[PDB]
């Protein structure tokens, strides 16, 4: 990944119309403050459609910052925070943000360092049922109950798109 992180941050902040996709995947020396800055910048950015920070050694502070962003941003379509060190608290914050977001259609939280746990999984399933705009959720539920409810929620949301198309 040869992405210029600082330049990318600047473009997000300036709402550069040519920046539709941000991929910071596998860049392992990005300071958390910089990732936090990207999240803050996205609050007012209207052109970035995809934001990915897979394997960036991100943690809860970054997840919470992105959760705040999701409640304000109404243009980002896909957020990927896979393979990081976000805890169940950080992940729950991201999913909870969906209660007040109708733009995001894809949220990938899969493969953090630690497991979420049944209690977090159950709350997530509940949240996915309260949001009707998300179409893809990147995560493999360990528990059957939450797994089926989430599978059904995503199927329902996708059916909505089909019924309202054109
Ligand atoms: Zn998984």
TrEMBL record:
Zn(2+) binds at residues 110, 140. The chain holds residues 165 to 330 of 345 of the full protein. Belongs to the tropomodulin family. It is found in: Cytoplasm, Cytoskeleton. This is Tropomodulin. The lineage of its organism: Eukaryota, Metazoa, Chordata, Craniata, Vertebrata.
């Amino acid at each position: 990944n040869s992405t210029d992180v600082e330049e990318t941050l600047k473009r997000i902040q300036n709402n550069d119309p040519d920046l539709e996709e941000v991929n910071l995947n596998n860049i392992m020396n990005i300071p958390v403050p910089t990732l936090k800055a990207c999240a803050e910048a996205l609050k007012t950015n209207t052109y970035v459609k995809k934001f990915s920070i897979v394997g960036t050694r991100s943690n809860d502070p970054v997840a919470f910052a992105l959760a705040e962003m999701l409640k304000v941003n109404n243009t980002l379509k896909s957020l990927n925070v896979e393979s990081n060190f976000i805890s169940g608290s950080g992940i729950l914050a991201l999913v909870e943000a969906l209660q007040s977001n109708t733009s995001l259609i894809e949220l990938r939280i899969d493969n953090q360092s630690q497991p979420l746990g049944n209690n977090v999984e159950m709350e997530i399933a509940n949240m996915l049922e309260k949001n009707t705009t998300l179409l893809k959720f990147g995560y493999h539920f360990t528990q059957q109950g939450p797994r089926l409810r989430a599978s059904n929620a995503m199927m329902n949301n996708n059916d909505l798109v089909r019924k309202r198309r054109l």
